[PDB]
Design a protein around this nucleic acid. Structure first.
Ligand SMILES: NCc1c[nH]c2nc(N)[nH]c(=O)c12
Ligand SMILES: [Mg+2]
Lengths: 1316, 613
DNA sequence: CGTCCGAAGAGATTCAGAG
DNA sequence: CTCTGAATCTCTTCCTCGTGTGGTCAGGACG
RNA sequence: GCAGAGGUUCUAGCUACACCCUCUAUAAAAAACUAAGGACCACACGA
């Protein structure tokens, strides 16, 4: 059983590995995140309501009043998504927040509030994510890429090597809050622990401990174990534990009860330790020497006077021992230091620490955090509390809590956002243990340590910033504001909260211009993850390690799809099967294995949970009972690939494609090609421009269906039904009655978007793929989008490829193309360029849009209308006038040179209060008529569905259907109908229809009035006319064309068809490629791709030959069935006996061009299968076909490789990149070339070029380029006169930039002058 | 504003944007000569617009300059004829976007082309280090007569045959022409036309076009080679030489001066580079330019006629590969058993696994080479005879056209051990070649190193740019100011030997360097080389015959010139094959020469005696 | 109608324990 | 016992060009 | 603009480097003469 599109054309699949989980919704990451951002959340977790609860307690300080958030309601959009794009306004929903303000009793907070003020206030306008997944923010679709940032929590870094220049590793502990100040503990070379906050100057680690109100004795107790020393007549023998002896050599005789277990100065062997436990003696004799070499852990005060014999953390001198002995301190508690196990890091810091109490510690903290500020008691306390113990200033997210607890081995999942004393002391203890070697440093590159912040979380954070701003405002206003006098709407200003969100959405490092260049590009950009942004790494800060891919990326982040450039690995693409966890971590679906059987149930595994388990290989043979065929299966356990027993492994890869992203998955035979070439090819696919005709990839992965359906370029069937009416503009489906809802339902109208200006200046064209009467099931693709063919993503054209070097035209990576390709318009692409002319309120009168321009050619005026706007569909050329803007007494917009084509549409926009001109009135009238026609059409189709349902049960009720037909069929209500089960529904339908006629008339009036009212415009502009220019760019020599495998090349020459090589059958090969790119750039897949394409076209040619003649349906059916079986345990095993003859005929007609092949990424076809498929056709199994030169007619030796490889034209057409200027506008620095193609600017002759001419003997050329071609107010003018006079004499002069330098340095205060 | 790249002195003063300049993508267009290039018709009209206006005024077609401006907008046929006249002899500088070396900017004679893309002659594409992957070249138009003469004299590609860094041809044929010549200059044991006697290379060409004899069949054909033994006189010698038909055909391309021995070999890439170097050394530069252009034309034509093609069946997977892999896996299992038994430690076991996997990789590579390079067995008028295999991929690798033996070993043999990004070698290598399907884990391991290499290459480019800038700035103020200092002091030049081998022969090191003093023969009191003589090829060979192991030579550090360098001390220009001319800026030349390879540079007992002596 | 309101490398900067 | 070399604390750079997209202050009354 | 004035045209046209013509109180007979405001920052891509 297959979907109708699949029935229309079913892709042969060579995948030998069954899939247990379908491809997840590719845009789920953005959609679900934004939905949770705006979803009403009753528990107030992960939503706008969470932010409202966190930021709106609003208890006025000394104001005995409170304003509390109640509920937030999203307002309906002012304009639709397409309307927002056209008008240029953002697609946003006004925020209706129910706010209740209560006033307590006079100076009685415990008293009940006297009255309430509950009302709804507009609080900013939040952009709405489209159903596609984008944001329209200034009339242009914008996609907010998800950010990969260091997960909040505690992380430990070695910082080994360069630090201390001695090989010693200086472990540091970093606690990164989600919001707040960083807390860093770092080790000194002298083993001194230092604390550093907010990357400021380092401070002794004891200082923060004192800020926790910890005494020195408490610090020693926390960070050190205490040995007990006992005063004895026998040289002060002390109680001791045998375990602490292990690991160090004894400096004394170990004797208890007169039995010397270990002698003086003897290394303690394992046997000695073991017998020490076996004796279980509590006291161990210690001489005066060993006790001397110790540091006391607690203060000991003499009994005589109470003064301390020893201060906390002071070395035990012999006289100190005598002083405490005469004092009588029998029990002595001193720190135990074992250089192997327990180092005196805390003790040494305490010695270095000069702040002996909490007061001095907070004084130091205040001085460091705010230098130059006189410290104060309360001020320092408040500063520290805000730094690390205030909820508003410092926040750890729930993900931060979980990561912190897991890193610190805490049992509880979540604690409190603010740091606690126990948390800090545990962090320090863990850092000490890492210093001792216990444990290991956390890995920053570990993907478990890097959580993904999606659009919802970022929007929540920016909304929180706006909320704290408005909270500051409202708390300042309320405190001094009159009670019960100002409404909350008066108290709340929506400007800051609106501005914060608008700034984040419109302009941010993560807020990016969506590239609509390709549906694949649209999908990839939405799923794309960038480490850049706020709270993230930059281009220069990031080192190699962050860019390098950590083996934990497997199944979460695509290794292959990383953009080439400065940002290599900073930007990554989400793997196809991955989806973010609740806490934001990446998860990979994995199949549970009980003992040997791979149970079909899938459990999503986090990166940290991936490490402990062992995961089976994707290419793991199965017995069809779930047991691994191989006794030992290759598996990855802890980032290491090693074979394991079949019983040992407990998880398996869900599918072979989970490693790659959406872009990489589309590449066929990706397994065979090198990783670098796969990366390049995946990058090229995004830049592929939609061709004039969308042609199915003759060879493809098979995921094109998923990309097309999940992308918004093509409309899908929300409800299955029959196609009532289909048009290029719009498609009408009549839904089946089961799909149809009982009331006001039965039709689904999809208004297909015609040629529209893409974000990358391409064309978004929605082409219907169905006709009348075709049964369309739910979820079916009604109309193909750009680069979409019958519901399959069609980025480019499958074109004939010959791998031979042809007269050097394909020299390094160049590509020949036959004139046949241009003749058939195979790669011709429509480009939409939008030119905007703005009339402005200028001085000495405003600019006049009316064609009052004088001193213009009559031919130019002819294209313009009476009002000066160019007629729709008038072909224009660069330099031709399009509008009639007149300088107030030549300012009219003209086509940019090198741009040509018909004007598809003119969207005149009028400011409110500005009268529309003749043409603008007509344009508005056309829009009003079109809106009226569309609303009348929607009413008519709604009426047709309503009439059908009413008629169906109109006969019931014992009234003749014909009598009701004589009455208006909708208004049968005048004729009484006996009550029946559906009579109430029919009465509701007719009453609703009568009310709907008024409501729809009001809706028509409102829609027309929206067009009639002058659109809001930027201030100071009377009107803006948006003229859309549409051009059919064709294949031009130098145009960049690339295959999916990364063999990028320019079109060297448009070779004539007869010159192109031809095989024995005489078919000329369309594209000739250099085979030398294959060996070095090891994209051997393109050769396999070419062979498989040849096999598919052989199948298609046999099908076409059967179709050209009149062949029995049984013969064609059996041949296509042979094609679709081909043995080799193919997963599909489709049976054509199910298909009807008409369905088989339609399938054959679709296959007449060729038979598509679904070759998955890593379970794709082997070479033997391709050989068998070639054998199915008449083609030689070798894949080499004898070829003849087109020009000479002489056969080539060594038969060449010929087959159809998918070919992509890239948007880097020569038309855009070609530029030149003789003379043009200059800048303020008087550098005559402005630079850039958009302005008439010249190429930068930079430092490298200067040194290049400098190494040569070039002096006159260098002087000329520097002076007369760049900056000389006199020389540039002179040289022009000399050249037009015919003599090439250069006046050197002095560059203007040098005078600029002189005046700037002289302004700086340095006397710089040119002395003679 | 004053300082940094953003700062004006770096931003504009050092590099000023220029008028009469333009960019476009690059196109091959082999039909062009080396000196000339392809220029778009529309681009030329904009670039040469002032020259066009002047020519129109001189013609009188435009009475006024305003009329001339209108005529250029009209683009009438008369304007295009005027453009042809201006384009005829105004050289255009062509500049690659990263100008690492002086060769990056080379002037060319512009030729009007219908296409909108600049065409660069194929031989000079290697010099530019540019490809056709949508590379873009800035094109500038020198204006003054001094500028045009400077361009034609020095900037033009024909002048810079040899790279400034090393006295070797920088126009060495790179990709397709070398493959075509290698197919042409190849021998087969048996092919149609074998054993024939041919009157001359013209007859060889006629037979090949008739198809009676293939390119690579051996025949007994006379060759009339002219010998330059008489200085400035050509002595014709005609002899019967047993060579292939293709080599005979290529002999027509070679000028008369060069000997026939150079063509008689396989003529790969180093071979053709040596051929060009010998042509430059023996004949003039202009004959060398004509020879190079003819080489490119013939190579492209015979490569196209050859029909070289890469295919899956062309790749050969050794039958011994699976057995070797199974033996290596059994050895690995044995080492794992030893580790479980405790005989070998974890580090020692890892080392042993790495060693055995490396040995297995070497054996797989050797078997693949044995079954790739000489695999073809061809009947030879009798018993079948093994011959060097004509496999296209092996032809590409052996000829040096593109891709070394390592790439082919990765292609058809097992890829081998791939180190994980930190630097440690993964215990389990990639046993699957690119022809076979790679496992997902294998692909992940490979992509580790691939991404590592890409990022390291990006930072290679960054650090190379920084180093080049620093070298230019430190060595900018170096120009040849004195013809001869006369400083007897100089550095001692000797071949460098680390004991294993002579890493640098003395011939290359002292080539084109003026002797510090008289070079006496190893025989005492015999002065082979005078005190101040430039060492061309003849002198360097003469020293080799007398086996002068140590030569004390002048160096730039030795010269006593202040704010300048001795012309004799610097030695040969290394690009024009003669003593450095006075006033040339050697400092920037050397800074660019050192900086440029930085992209290629990777960022990351018993005394055995080789031979008796 | 103006018009006021990372990384790395290197050179100072301590600083210091030692002959 | 007053300066060792040594640890520390700021300062400067970190390619080279294209091509497209976008977003933008100071500083509002006021006589 | 010989100095003052006006000027065909081929935006504007005794200076921008400018230039020329005719004429005697004020415009009108004629051809040859000449280059325009673009600052910064982010994102993405291509080499
Ligand atoms: N720039 C001077 C000028 C303005 N109008 C002119 N008309 C003519 N015939 N001649 C000129 O020289 C001028
Ligand atoms: Mg390139």
């Amino acid at each position: 059983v297959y979907s109708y599109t699949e029935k229309k054309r079913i892709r042969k699949d060579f995948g030998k590995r069954p899939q247990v989980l379908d491809v997840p919704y590719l845009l789920s990451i953005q959609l679900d995140s934004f939905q949770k951002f705006i979803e009403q959340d009753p528990e107030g977790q992960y939503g706008l309501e969470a932010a409202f609860r966190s930021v709106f307690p609003i208890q006025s300080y000394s104001g005995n009043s409170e304003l509390q958030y109640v509920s937030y309601r999203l307002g309906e959009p002012v304009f639709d998504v397409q309307e927002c794009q056209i008008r240029g306004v953002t697609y946003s929903a006004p925020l209706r927040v129910k706010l209740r303000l209560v006033i307590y009793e006079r100076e009685a907070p415990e008293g009940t509030v006297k009255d309430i003020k509950e009302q709804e206030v507009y609080m900013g306008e939040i952009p709405l994510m489209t159903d596609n997944g984008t944001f329209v923010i200034n009339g242009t679709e914008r996609v907010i890429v998800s950010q990969l940032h260091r997960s909040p929590g505690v992380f430990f870094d070695s910082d080994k090597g360069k630090t201390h220049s001695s090989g010693k590793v200086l472990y540091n502990a970093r606690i990164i809050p989600y919001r707040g100040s960083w807390l860093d503990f770092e080790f000194d070379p002298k083993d001194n622990l230092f604390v550093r906050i907010d990357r400021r100057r380092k401070l002794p680690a004891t200082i923060i401990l004192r800020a926790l109100n910890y005494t020195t004795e408490q610090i020693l107790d926390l960070f050190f174990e205490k040995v007990i020393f006992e005063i004895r007549d026998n040289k002060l023998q002390m109680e001791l534990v045998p375990e602490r002896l292990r690991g160090e050599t004894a400096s004394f005789d170990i004797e208890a009860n007169g039995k010397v277990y270990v002698e003086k100065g003897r290394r303690i062997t394992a046997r000695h330790i073991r017998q020490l436990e076996k004796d279980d003696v509590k006291l161990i004799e210690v001489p005066v020497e060993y006790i001397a070499g110790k540091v006391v852990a607690k203060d000991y005060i003499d009994e005589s006077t109470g003064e301390l014999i020893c201060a906390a953390n002071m070395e035990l001198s012999l006289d100190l021992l005598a002083k405490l002995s005469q004092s009588g301190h029998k029990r002595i508690e001193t720190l135990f230091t074992n250089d192997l196990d327990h180092g005196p890091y805390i003790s040494e810091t305490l010695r270095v620490d000069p702040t002996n109490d909490r007061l001095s510690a907070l004084v130091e903290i205040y001085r460091m955090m705010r230098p130059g500020e006189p410290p104060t008691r309360e001020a320092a306390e408040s500063l520290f509390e805000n730094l690390f113990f205030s909820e508003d200033r410092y926040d750890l997210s729930a993900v931060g809590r979980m990561k912190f607890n897991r890193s610190l081995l805490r049992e509880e999942i979540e604690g409190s956002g603010i740091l606690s004393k126990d948390d800090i002391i545990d962090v320090m203890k863990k850092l000490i243990d890492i210093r001792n070697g216990k444990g290991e440093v956390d890995d920053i590159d570990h993907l478990g340590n890097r959580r993904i912040r999606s659009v919802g979380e970022m929007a929540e954070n920016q909304f929180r910033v706006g909320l704290v701003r408005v909270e500051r405002a409202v708390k300042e206003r309320l405190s001094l504001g009159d009670l019960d006098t100002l409404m909350p709407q008066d108290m709340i200003n929506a400007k800051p909260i609106s501005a914060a969100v608008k700034e984040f959405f419109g302009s941010s490092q993560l807020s990016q211009f969506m590239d609509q260049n390709n549906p694949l590009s649209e999908i990839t950009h939405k799923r794309r993850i960038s480490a850049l942004g706020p709270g993230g790494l930059t281009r220069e800060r990031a080192g190699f390690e962050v860019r390098d891919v950590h083996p934990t990326h497997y199944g979460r982040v695509c290794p292959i799809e990383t953009p080439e450039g400065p940002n290599i690995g900073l930007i990554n693409s989400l793997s196809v099967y991955a989806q973010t966890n609740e806490y934001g971590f990446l998860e990979t679906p994995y199949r549970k294995v009980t003992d040997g059987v791979v149970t079909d149930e899938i459990h999503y595994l986090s990166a940290i949970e991936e490490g402990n388990y062992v995961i089976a290989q994707a290419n793991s043979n199965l017995d069809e009972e779930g047991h691994f065929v191989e006794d030992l299966v290759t598996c990855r356990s802890k980032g290491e690939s090693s074979l394991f027993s079949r019983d040992q492994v407990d998880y398996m890869d869900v599918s072979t494609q989970q490693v790659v992203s959406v872009g990489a998955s589309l590449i066929p035979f990706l397994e065979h090609d090198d990783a670098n070439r796969a990366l390049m090819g995946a990058n090229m696919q995004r830049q592929a421009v939609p061709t004039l005709r969308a042609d199915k990839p003759l060879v493809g992965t098979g995921m094109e269906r998923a990309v097309a359906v999940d992308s918004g370029v093509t409309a899908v069937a929300k409800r299955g039904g029959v196609v009532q009416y289909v048009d290029a503009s719009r498609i009408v489906i009549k839904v089946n009655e089961d799909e149809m809802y009982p009331g006001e339902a039965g039709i689904d109208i999809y208004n297909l978007t015609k040629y529209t200006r893409s974000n990358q200046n391409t064309c978004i064209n929605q082409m219907p793929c169905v006709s009348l009467g075709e049964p369309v099931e739910r979820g079916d693709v009604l109309a193909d989008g750009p680069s979409t063919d019958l519901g399959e993503l069609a980025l480019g054209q499958n074109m004939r490829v010959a791998f031979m070097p042809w007269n050097g035209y394909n020299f390094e990576d160049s590509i020949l193309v036959s004139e046949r390709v241009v003749q058939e318009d195979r790669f011709t692409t429509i480009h939409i360029q939008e030119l905007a002319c703005v009339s402005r309120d200028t001085k000495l009168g405003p600019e006049e849009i009316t064609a009052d321009i004088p001193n213009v050619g009559e031919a130019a005026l002819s294209k313009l209308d009476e009002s000066g706007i160019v007629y729709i569909g008038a072909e224009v050329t660069g330099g031709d006038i399009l509008v009639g803007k007149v300088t107030p007494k030549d300012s009219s917009l003209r086509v940019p040179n090198g741009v040509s084509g018909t004007v598809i549409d003119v969207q005149v926009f009028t400011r409110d209060g500005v009268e529309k001109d003749k043409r603008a009135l007509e344009i508005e009238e056309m829009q009003l008529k079109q809106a009226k026609k569309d609303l009348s059409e929607e009413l008519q189709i709604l009426e047709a569905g309503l009439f059908s349902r009413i008629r169906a049960v109109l006969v019931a009720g014992g009234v003749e259907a014909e009598k009701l037909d004589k009455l208006p069929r909708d208004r049968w209500l005048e004729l009484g109908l006996t009550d029946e089960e559906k009579q109430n529904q029919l009465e509701q339908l007719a009453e609703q229809y009568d009310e709907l006629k008024h409501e729809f008339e009001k809706k028509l009036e409102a829609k027309r009035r929206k067009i009639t009212q002058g659109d809001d415009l930027a201030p100071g502009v009377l009107k803006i006319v948006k003229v859309y220019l549409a051009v059919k760019r064709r294949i031009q020599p130098g145009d960049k064309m690339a295959g999916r495998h990364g063999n990028k090349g320019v079109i060297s020459k448009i070779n004539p068809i007869e010159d192109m090589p031809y095989d024995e059958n005489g078919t000329p090969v369309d594209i000739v490629l250099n085979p030398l790119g294959v060996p070095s750039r090891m994209n051997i897949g393109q050769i396999l791709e070419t062979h498989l394409g040849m096999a598919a076209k052989g199948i298609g040619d046999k099908i076409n030959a059967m179709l050209k003649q009149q062949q029995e349906v049984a013969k064609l059916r059996e041949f296509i069935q042979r094609a679709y079986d081909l043995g080799a345990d193919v997963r599909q095993k489709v049976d054509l006996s199910t298909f009807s003859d008409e369905e088989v005929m339609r399938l054959a007609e679709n296959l007449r061009k060729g038979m598509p092949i679904a070759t998955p990424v890593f379970d794709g076809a082997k070479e033997a299968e391709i050989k068998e498929l070639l054998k199915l056709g008449d083609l030689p199994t070798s894949g080499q076909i004898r070829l003849y030169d087109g020009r000479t007619g002489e056969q080539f030796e060594r038969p060449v490789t010929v087959g159809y490889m998918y070919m992509l034209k890239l948007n880097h057409l020569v038309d855009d990149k070609m530029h030149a200027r003789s003379t043009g506008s200059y800048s303020l620095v008087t550098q005559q070339p402005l630079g850039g193609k958009a302005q008439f600017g010249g190429q930068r002759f930079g430092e490298m070029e200067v040194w290049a001419l400098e190494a040569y003997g070039a002096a006159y050329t260098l002087q000329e380029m520097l002076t007369v071609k760049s900056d000389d107010v006199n020389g540039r003018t002179k040289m022009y006169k000399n050249i037009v006079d015919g003599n090439h004499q250069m006046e050197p002069g002095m560059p203007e930039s040098f005078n600029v330098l002189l005046k700037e340095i002289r302004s700086l205060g340095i006397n710089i002058e040119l002395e003679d | 504003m004053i300082k940094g790249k953003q700062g004006r002195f770096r931003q504009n003063l050092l590099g000023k944007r220029v008028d009469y300049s333009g960019r476009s993508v690059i196109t091959v267009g082999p039909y062009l000569r080396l000196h000339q290039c392809g220029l778009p018709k529309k681009m030329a009209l904009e670039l040469f617009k002032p020259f066009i206006y002047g020519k129109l005024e001189l013609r009188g077609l435009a009475t006024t300059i305003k009329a001339a401006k209108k005529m250029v907008e009209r683009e009438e046929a008369v304007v295009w004829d005027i453009l042809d006249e201006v384009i005829r002899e105004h050289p255009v500088l062509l500049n690659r976007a990263p100008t690492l070396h002086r060769l990056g900017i080379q002037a060319f004679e512009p030729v009007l082309i219908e296409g909108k893309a600049i065409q660069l002659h194929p031989l000079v594409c290697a010099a530019y280090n540019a490809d056709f992957d949508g590379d873009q070249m800035a094109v500038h138009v020198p204006l003054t007569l001094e500028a045009q003469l400077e361009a034609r004299a020095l900037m033009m590609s024909t002048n810079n045959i040899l790279s400034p860094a090393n006295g070797e041809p920088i126009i060495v044929p790179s990709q397709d022409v070398v493959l075509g010549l290698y197919y042409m200059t190849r021998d087969c044991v048996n092919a149609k036309g074998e054993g024939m006697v041919l009157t001359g290379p013209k007859e060889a060409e006629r037979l090949y076009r008739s198809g009676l004899a293939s390119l690579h069949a051996r025949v007994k054909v006379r060759i009339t080679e002219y010998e330059k033994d008489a200085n400035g006189e050509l002595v014709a010698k005609t002899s019967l030489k047993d060579t292939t038909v293709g080599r005979a055909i290529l002999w027509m391309i070679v000028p008369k001066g060069l000997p026939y021995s150079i063509v008689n070999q396989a003529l790969g890439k180093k071979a053709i580079s040596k051929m060009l170097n010998t042509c430059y050394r023996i004949l003039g530069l202009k004959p060398t330019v004509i020879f190079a252009d003819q080489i490119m034309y013939t190579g492209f034509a015979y490569a196209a006629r050859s029909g070289a093609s890469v295919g899956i069946d062309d790749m050969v997977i050794p039958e011994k590969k699976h057995e070797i892999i199974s033996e290596a896996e059994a050895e690995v299992a044995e080492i794992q058993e030893q580790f479980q038994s405790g005989l070998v430690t974890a580090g020692e076991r890892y080392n042993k696994v790495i060693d055995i996997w490396a040995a297995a990789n070497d054996r797989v590579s050797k078997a693949m080479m044995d079954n790739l390079q000489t695999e073809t067995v061809i009947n030879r008028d009798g018993q079948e005879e093994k011959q060097v295999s004509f496999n296209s991929i092996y032809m590409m690798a052996d000829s040096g056209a593109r891709g070394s033996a390592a790439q082919i070993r990765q292609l058809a043999g097992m890829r081998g051990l791939m180190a994980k990004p930190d630097g440690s070698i993964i215990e389990t290598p990639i046993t699957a070649n690119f022809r076979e399907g790679l496992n997902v884990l294998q692909y992940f391991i490979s992509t580790h190193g691939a991404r590592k290499g890409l990022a390291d290459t990006a930072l290679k480019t960054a650090n190379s740019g920084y180093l080049t800038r620093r070298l230019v700035d430190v060595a900018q103020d170096l120009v040849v100011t004195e013809d001869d200092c006369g400083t007897h002091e100089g550095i001692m030049m000797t071949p460098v030997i680390e004991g294993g081998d002579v890493k640098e022969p003395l011939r290359d090191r002292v080539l084109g360097r003026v002797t510090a003093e008289d070079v006496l023969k190893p025989g005492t009191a015999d002065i082979l080389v005078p005190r101040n003589t430039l060492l061309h090829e003849q002198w360097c060979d003469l020293l080799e015959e007398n086996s002068v192991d140590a030569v004390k030579v002048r160096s730039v550090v030795s010269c006593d010139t202040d704010f300048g360098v001795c012309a004799h001390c610097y030695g040969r220009d290394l690009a024009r094959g003669h003593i450095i001319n006075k006033g040339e800026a050697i400092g920037v030349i050397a800074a660019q020469s050192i900086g440029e390879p930085g992209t290629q540079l990777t960022m990351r007992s018993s005394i055995q005696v080789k031979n008796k002596g």
